[PDB]
Design a protein around this ligand. Structure first.
Ligand code: HEM
Length: 110
């Protein structure tokens, strides 16, 4: 199976390398990037992200509900366009399909 857990790890590395301040919104605020895998808050969040990717691919994802929840953290369209670029890099690094269509579905509600 596509190793979405590894893709997601590379996604967050890309995302917080380019936009370190985004990490302040998470329960692993302030944690060194090379230590995220040892942080309990990160382990839970990355698992949720992996679950959402599998739901989007499996056809059950609630993109409107995910967008609304991100709006609820003052995360919007600009951040998701940046996420699109970071996910494209993470997917390419693993020879995984791109997640641009799933991220566009979220963007359609932002
Ligand atoms: C590929 C794009 C992204 C996906 C698939 C995604 C996925 C998720 C999921 C599945 C959750 C958990 C929602 C739930 O528990 O109901 C979540 C929470 C969250 N996301 Fe994202 N996200 C993305 C990008 C971003 C970006 C760019 C930021 C900007 C900071 C961000 C900020 C947050 C925050 C702050 C939370 C709440 C974390 C907490 O409860 O501690 N997300 N996201």
């Amino acid at each position: 199976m596509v190793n979405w857990a590894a893709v997601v790890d590379d996604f967050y590395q890309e995302l917080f390398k380019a936009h370190p301040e985004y990490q302040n919104k998470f329960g692993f605020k302030g944690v060194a990037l090379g230590s995220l895998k040892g942080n309990a808050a990160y382990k839970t969040q990355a698992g949720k992200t992996v679950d959402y990717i599998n739901a989007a691919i499996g056809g059950s994802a609630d993109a409107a509900g995910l967008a609304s929840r991100h709006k609820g953290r003052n995360v919007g369209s600009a951040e998701f366009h940046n996420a699109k670029a970071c996910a494209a890099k993470a997917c390419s690094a693993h020879g995984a399909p791109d997640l641009g269509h799933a991220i566009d579905d979220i963007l359609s509600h932002l």
